[PDB]
Short mmCIF file of C-alpha atoms (C1' of nucleotides) and ligand atoms in Angstrom, two decimals:
data_model
loop_
_atom_site.label_atom_id
_atom_site.label_comp_id
_atom_site.label_asym_id
_atom_site.label_seq_id
_atom_site.Cartn_x
_atom_site.Cartn_y
_atom_site.Cartn_z
CA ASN J 1 57.45 -146.91 75.25
CA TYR J 2 55.83 -143.64 74.63
CA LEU J 3 54.18 -142.04 71.71
CA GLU J 4 55.13 -138.54 70.70
CA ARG J 5 54.20 -136.10 68.05
CA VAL J 6 55.53 -132.54 67.66
CA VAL J 7 52.96 -129.89 66.85
CA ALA J 8 54.68 -126.55 65.85
CA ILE J 9 58.31 -125.81 65.05
CA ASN J 10 59.35 -122.17 64.51
CA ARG J 11 62.57 -119.93 64.96
CA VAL J 12 62.42 -116.84 67.05
CA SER J 13 64.59 -113.97 66.61
CA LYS J 14 66.35 -111.47 69.36
CA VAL J 15 68.10 -108.32 68.23
CA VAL J 16 71.69 -108.25 69.96
CA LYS J 17 74.54 -105.70 69.46
CA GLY J 18 76.49 -107.34 66.49
CA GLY J 19 73.68 -109.00 64.71
CA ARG J 20 70.86 -111.56 65.05
CA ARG J 21 70.35 -114.38 67.46
CA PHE J 22 68.12 -117.35 66.74
CA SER J 23 66.62 -119.92 68.95
CA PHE J 24 64.14 -122.65 68.24
CA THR J 25 60.82 -123.76 70.24
CA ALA J 26 59.09 -126.84 69.46
CA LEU J 27 56.02 -127.92 71.38
CA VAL J 28 56.02 -131.75 71.79
CA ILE J 29 52.99 -134.01 72.95
CA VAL J 30 54.01 -137.26 74.57
CA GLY J 31 51.77 -140.17 75.65
CA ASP J 32 51.44 -143.78 75.91
CA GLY J 33 48.53 -143.81 73.57
CA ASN J 34 45.84 -145.36 76.18
CA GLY J 35 45.01 -142.60 78.55
CA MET J 36 48.18 -140.60 79.24
CA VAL J 37 49.02 -137.27 77.66
CA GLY J 38 51.85 -134.80 78.12
CA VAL J 39 52.44 -131.28 76.93
CA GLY J 40 55.79 -129.73 76.65
CA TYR J 41 56.81 -126.38 75.21
CA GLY J 42 60.45 -126.56 75.07
CA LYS J 43 63.12 -123.89 73.86
CA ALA J 44 66.72 -124.17 72.85
CA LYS J 45 69.33 -123.03 70.29
CA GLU J 46 68.95 -126.40 68.49
CA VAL J 47 65.75 -128.31 67.34
CA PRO J 48 67.08 -131.55 68.96
CA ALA J 49 67.67 -129.88 72.34
CA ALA J 50 64.48 -128.18 71.86
CA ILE J 51 62.25 -131.46 71.32
CA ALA J 52 64.11 -133.09 74.11
CA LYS J 53 63.24 -130.37 76.52
CA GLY J 54 59.58 -130.50 75.20
CA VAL J 55 59.58 -134.31 75.84
CA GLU J 56 60.94 -133.80 79.25
CA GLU J 57 58.42 -131.23 79.99
CA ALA J 58 55.63 -133.52 78.83
CA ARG J 59 56.66 -136.36 80.98
CA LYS J 60 56.84 -133.84 83.84
CA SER J 61 53.46 -132.64 83.15
CA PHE J 62 51.60 -135.67 82.27
CA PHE J 63 47.91 -135.95 83.78
CA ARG J 64 44.91 -138.16 83.78
CA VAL J 65 42.19 -138.15 81.30
CA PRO J 66 38.76 -139.63 81.98
CA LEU J 67 37.70 -142.38 79.41
CA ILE J 68 34.57 -144.31 79.14
CA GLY J 69 35.53 -146.89 76.56
CA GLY J 70 37.58 -145.12 73.95
CA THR J 71 35.44 -141.95 73.93
CA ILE J 72 34.78 -139.04 76.25
CA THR J 73 31.96 -139.14 78.49
CA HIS J 74 29.97 -135.90 77.82
CA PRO J 75 30.52 -132.87 75.29
CA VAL J 76 32.98 -130.31 76.69
CA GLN J 77 33.84 -126.89 75.65
CA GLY J 78 37.28 -125.72 76.49
CA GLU J 79 39.03 -122.32 76.24
CA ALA J 80 42.94 -121.45 76.31
CA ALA J 81 44.10 -117.71 76.50
CA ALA J 82 43.01 -117.60 72.92
CA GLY J 83 42.23 -121.17 71.65
CA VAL J 84 38.54 -122.23 71.73
CA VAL J 85 38.13 -126.11 71.11
CA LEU J 86 34.99 -128.22 72.08
CA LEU J 87 35.18 -131.95 72.32
CA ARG J 88 32.13 -134.39 72.08
CA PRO J 89 31.44 -138.05 72.32
CA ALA J 90 31.07 -139.97 69.03
CA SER J 91 30.00 -143.49 68.12
CA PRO J 92 32.60 -146.13 68.38
CA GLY J 93 32.65 -146.81 64.63
CA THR J 94 33.91 -143.06 63.98
CA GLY J 95 37.32 -142.40 64.23
CA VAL J 96 39.08 -139.19 65.35
CA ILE J 97 38.03 -136.00 63.89
CA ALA J 98 40.14 -132.82 64.67
CA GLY J 99 42.80 -130.53 63.37
CA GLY J 100 46.50 -131.07 63.64
CA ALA J 101 47.19 -130.03 67.16
CA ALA J 102 43.73 -131.38 68.43
CA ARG J 103 44.14 -134.62 66.70
CA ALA J 104 47.81 -134.99 67.95
CA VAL J 105 46.92 -134.32 71.51
CA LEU J 106 43.91 -136.91 71.32
CA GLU J 107 45.91 -139.62 69.74
CA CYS J 108 48.63 -139.17 72.19
CA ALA J 109 45.93 -139.36 74.94
CA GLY J 110 44.46 -142.63 73.58
CA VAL J 111 40.94 -141.39 72.48
CA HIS J 112 39.50 -143.39 69.59
CA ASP J 113 35.99 -141.64 69.13
CA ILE J 114 35.74 -137.90 69.29
CA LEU J 115 34.37 -134.71 67.57
CA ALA J 116 36.61 -131.67 67.90
CA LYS J 117 36.46 -128.26 66.23
CA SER J 118 38.51 -125.18 66.74
CA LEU J 119 36.51 -121.68 67.04
CA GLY J 120 39.08 -119.43 68.58
CA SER J 121 42.52 -118.39 67.46
CA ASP J 122 44.29 -120.86 65.05
CA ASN J 123 47.63 -120.75 67.07
CA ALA J 124 48.79 -124.17 67.73
CA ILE J 125 50.08 -123.63 71.28
CA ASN J 126 46.57 -121.96 72.29
CA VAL J 127 44.70 -124.67 70.41
CA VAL J 128 46.88 -127.40 72.52
CA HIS J 129 46.18 -125.42 75.72
CA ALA J 130 42.35 -125.25 75.02
CA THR J 131 42.22 -128.91 74.13
CA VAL J 132 44.07 -129.90 77.33
CA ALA J 133 41.90 -127.68 79.44
CA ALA J 134 38.73 -129.45 77.96
CA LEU J 135 40.28 -132.69 79.04
CA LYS J 136 40.89 -130.93 82.61
CA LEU J 137 37.35 -129.91 82.99
CA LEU J 138 36.40 -133.45 81.97
CA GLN J 139 35.10 -135.18 84.71
CA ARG J 140 34.17 -138.75 85.74
CA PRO J 141 30.43 -140.23 86.15
CA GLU J 142 31.88 -142.16 89.30
CA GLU J 143 33.32 -138.61 90.50
CA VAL J 144 29.90 -136.95 90.17
CA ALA J 145 28.17 -139.93 91.73
CA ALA J 146 30.75 -139.31 94.81
CA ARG J 147 29.72 -135.87 94.66
CA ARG J 148 25.90 -136.38 94.72
CA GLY J 149 24.88 -139.69 95.73
CA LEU J 150 22.99 -142.75 94.30
CA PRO J 151 25.18 -143.50 91.53
CA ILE J 152 22.17 -144.42 89.19
CA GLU J 153 21.21 -140.86 87.71
CA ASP J 154 23.69 -141.64 84.86
CA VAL J 155 23.69 -143.39 81.45
CA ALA J 156 26.57 -145.93 80.44
CA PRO J 157 25.03 -148.23 78.05
CA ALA J 158 28.40 -149.21 76.62
CA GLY J 159 29.49 -149.97 80.29
CA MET J 160 32.45 -152.29 80.54
"C1'" U M 1 25.25 -141.70 63.81
"C1'" G M 2 27.67 -136.62 63.64
"C1'" G M 3 31.83 -130.50 63.63
"C1'" A M 4 39.80 -131.15 60.69
"C1'" G M 5 42.75 -127.07 58.84
"C1'" A M 6 46.79 -124.52 56.03
"C1'" G M 7 49.13 -120.26 54.20
"C1'" U M 8 49.54 -114.85 54.47
"C1'" U M 9 50.97 -108.06 58.73
"C1'" U M 10 56.33 -108.62 62.48
"C1'" G M 11 63.49 -108.15 63.99
"C1'" A M 12 60.75 -112.09 66.91
"C1'" U M 13 55.56 -112.71 69.95
"C1'" C M 14 50.28 -112.93 71.08
"C1'" C M 15 45.28 -111.17 69.60
"C1'" U M 16 41.91 -108.75 66.13
"C1'" G M 17 41.02 -108.83 61.12
"C1'" G M 18 40.78 -109.55 56.05
"C1'" C M 19 42.33 -112.44 51.07
"C1'" U M 20 43.65 -117.43 48.98
"C1'" C M 21 43.32 -122.63 49.32
"C1'" A M 22 42.30 -127.74 49.98
"C1'" G M 23 35.68 -130.80 49.13
"C1'" G M 24 31.25 -131.46 46.90
"C1'" A M 25 27.51 -130.23 43.31
"C1'" C M 26 25.54 -128.55 37.66
"C1'" G M 27 19.78 -129.31 31.76
"C1'" A M 28 27.13 -127.17 31.65
"C1'" A M 29 31.20 -125.21 27.90
"C1'" C M 30 36.19 -125.34 26.67
"C1'" G M 31 41.53 -128.36 26.03
"C1'" C M 32 43.46 -133.26 25.19
"C1'" U M 33 42.17 -138.15 24.93
"C1'" G M 34 38.33 -141.57 23.97
"C1'" G M 35 35.73 -149.18 23.63
"C1'" C M 36 31.05 -151.22 24.94
"C1'" G M 37 26.40 -151.94 27.49
"C1'" G M 38 22.23 -150.89 31.43
"C1'" C M 39 19.46 -146.33 32.69
"C1'" G M 40 18.53 -141.31 32.35
"C1'" U M 41 19.24 -136.28 30.22
"C1'" G M 42 20.13 -132.47 26.32
"C1'" C M 43 17.99 -123.95 23.24
"C1'" U M 44 19.51 -122.16 30.55
"C1'" U M 45 20.59 -116.81 25.20
"C1'" A M 46 15.94 -114.21 20.96
"C1'" A M 47 7.77 -115.42 24.38
"C1'" C M 48 13.36 -113.91 17.81
"C1'" A M 49 11.05 -115.13 12.44
"C1'" C M 50 9.66 -119.38 9.96
"C1'" A M 51 10.11 -123.18 4.11
"C1'" U M 52 7.98 -128.01 4.66
"C1'" G M 53 5.21 -132.91 6.33
"C1'" C M 54 2.12 -134.70 10.24
"C1'" A M 55 -0.50 -133.30 15.11
"C1'" A M 56 -9.12 -134.34 15.84
"C1'" G M 57 -11.83 -136.50 14.14
"C1'" U M 58 -16.12 -140.12 14.30
"C1'" C M 59 -21.36 -142.13 13.86
"C1'" G M 60 -25.37 -145.50 7.64
"C1'" A M 61 -28.11 -148.97 14.33
"C1'" A M 62 -30.54 -140.37 13.45
"C1'" C M 63 -31.55 -138.40 8.03
"C1'" G M 64 -32.14 -136.98 2.94
"C1'" G M 65 -29.11 -138.73 -1.21
"C1'" A M 66 -25.46 -142.32 -4.72
"C1'" A M 67 -19.43 -139.84 -6.20
"C1'" A M 68 -16.33 -144.73 -5.64
"C1'" G M 69 -15.94 -150.51 -4.79
"C1'" G M 70 -17.34 -155.25 -5.64
"C1'" U M 71 -21.56 -155.93 -7.12
"C1'" C M 72 -27.80 -160.05 -9.36
"C1'" U M 73 -29.76 -156.47 -12.39
"C1'" C M 74 -30.93 -153.49 -18.78
MG1 MG X 1 40.54 -116.70 64.01
MG1 MG X 2 44.29 -116.05 59.57
MG1 MG X 3 58.58 -104.15 66.64
MG1 MG X 4 54.06 -102.78 60.91
MG1 MG X 5 41.67 -112.12 70.86
MG1 MG X 6 -19.38 -134.17 12.41
#
RNA sequence: UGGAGAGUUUGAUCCUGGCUCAGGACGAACGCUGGCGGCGUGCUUAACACAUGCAAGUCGAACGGAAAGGUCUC
């Protein structure tokens, strides 16, 4: 009962003595669609083994995302090795606006209102890494309240 | 109250970095097709040259006079 989507599929080549060797790497994003998201690179000779390894790695690397009612709390600006993607909270009426990789990761996480744009490299893996990094630097208002004190210096009009 | 990406350098990879695309818009033209109504718009080029008709007249309660109208008048 998980939601999975593949982001990029490509074939690699390595030169051997007698000829050519091929292999398949397929990044797969897995989640339950509410708050859980997983990232798996994966690599094998065949595409089924590759996406199976990607799914397994995503299950292993599942990580928690902070939500405030279907949207993120405050705008964030992550950066991968080369990917640069920023995320901003949006009105509940607005859907999810993002590219391929970013939208796949966000929809596996379970975000319904988000504004995402890519400003760095256009590589799918780096875009995914930048998006998940931004999700990591995303924090919780309750956590920052624990950090400072007096959990009143925050705005949560939606609440719930 | 509002931010999408895709293709393309390599034996395969990551960057940098060009080129192309997906969208909208117009006092528009072309190709094909073509029922109607509401509302708008229509020489963007030669401030090039123009046949022709109409686009600034009015007052007799300012004035001298009577061409015409009906007119009493010979
Ligand atoms: Mg770029
Ligand atoms: Mg490019
Ligand atoms: Mg080489
Ligand atoms: Mg070369
Ligand atoms: Mg770079
Ligand atoms: Mg006069």
